[PDB]
């Protein structure tokens, strides 16, 4: 895949004036990829377990609540809901 450009875009969002090395974004690539893997795997696990062949806002939200520790789970669920509203709307 390739997400380093969007990693830098998010860095600008949080820090419009912050640079970052090559291996640091490699570490971000690994971190985002592994969390992305965790979320997608949990969502597909729920979908396969349920009759839902689909992975939806329900699936990703439940996975986010299950995996993330507390306040992190709350923030991630809120952000996912907000972005789902943005994209669907």
């Amino acid at each position: 895949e390739s997400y380093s450009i969007y990693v830098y875009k998010v860095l600008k969002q949080v820090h419009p004036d912050t640079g970052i090395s090559s291996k640091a974004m490699g570490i971000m690539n690994s971190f985002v990829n592994d969390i992305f893997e965790r979320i997608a795997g949990e969502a597909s696990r729920l979908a396969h377990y349920n009759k839902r062949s689909t992975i939806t806002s329900r699936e990703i939200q439940t996975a986010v609540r299950l995996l993330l520790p507390g306040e992190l789970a709350k923030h991630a669920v809120s952000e996912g809901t907000k972005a789902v509203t943005k994209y669907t709307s």
Partner: protein, 85 residues
Amino acid sequence: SRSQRAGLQFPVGRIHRHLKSRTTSHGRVGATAAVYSAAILEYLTAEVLELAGNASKDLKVKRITPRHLQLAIRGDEELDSLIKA
């Protein structure tokens, strides 16, 4: 581009491609799931990079470095648990 539609700097589209790649037989992924994953990823990266730029005594980092990343996550003990999970 679907990314900006979600207000997410990250690619909801390529993300959904990856999701499809990581589903079960006939296992589909909704667009809402794609954008939800992209949004949680953007927020996690945003917090991590926020603390990485702030991963220092002066609370600003010129270049984000692996060490700044360890400080951002580890010091963000929520992220410490999340990554260690």
